Amino acid sequence: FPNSTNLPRNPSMADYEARIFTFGTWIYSVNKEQLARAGFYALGEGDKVKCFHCGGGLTDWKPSEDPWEQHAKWYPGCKYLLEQKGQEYINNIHLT
């Protein structure tokens, strides 16, 4: 943990539409579209979410937080993250 290979930890959540559906009753400020685009889906347990690829989990979100930024901060090895945001983006989140 987390998963840093090229195979998704949860294939059933690889589709954006599948992930966005999990946010049907989302009551938190952090944007659902942004979360789903960042690879996350809701567990239905508070504001807990997990990335379908690396399986990384995030909770206790702040109102203006950026999902992609938190994804890179805690799970830099995620391959979906790499594919979507690039290595420079990730490395910059962990700048000297």
Partner: peptide, 4 residues
């Protein structure tokens, strides 16, 4: 955000 906090990881879990």
């Amino acid at each position: 955000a906090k990881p879990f």
